[PDB]
Symmetry: C2
Subunit: 110 residues, 2 copies
């Protein structure tokens, strides 16, 4: 689409591959999403349960380690971090199952 | 003796402001592996009330982009279960504002090294 990559929202009409590229093993590639989530984006039935872990803009810049890398491909704002699950949430076990369904799911794609 | 009165939201959903600053919401800036390193004294104190916040927030990802672009993992450790993330967001080097964006981001990256 015409938006900067980081502001795109994937849906059935403009899916994860279209917005964010194929899943893969490279540092530059995303690794998250089974075939259903890839094709459906935010239309995926359990999208809200995934999105609850995504950071607000304030938390993205507040929690992460932020860097800047200048490479031949361009200038990149790098980010890394970790978000703790609330194991006192009764939904904790469902959250673990859901994340396990999508993290590196492309390793099973035919 | 207390938790901050604005701390009810999960950490990743918090919004820092003058009333709930970056240190209060997200911890002291520092060098350690999962510790935040971003913000000068003005941004730390003001959070999203910082007058140039929109020019920083233009680089933050939507929830869909966060899960679509990043490398996501999960780790179970003695402290709990953690969703790990890494990624990179490309700046538009053809934007006339590009040089100013770089200056603004660099002003905040590791700024904590220069003050107590």
């Amino acid at each position: 689409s015409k938006k900067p990559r980081q502001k795109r929202t994937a849906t059935k009409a403009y899916n994860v591959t279209q917005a964010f590229g194929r899943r893969g093993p490279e540092q530059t590639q995303g690794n998250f999403g089974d075939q259903e989530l890839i094709r459906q984006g935010t239309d995926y039935k359990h999208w809200p349960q995934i999105a609850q872990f995504a950071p607000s803009a304030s938390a993205f810049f507040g929690m992460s380690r932020i860097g800047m890398e200048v490479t031949p491909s361009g200038t990149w704002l790098t980010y890394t971090g970790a978000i703790k699950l609330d194991d006192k949430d009764p939904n904790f076990k469902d959250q673990v199952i859901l994340l396990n369904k999508h993290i590196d799911a492309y390793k099973t794609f035919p």
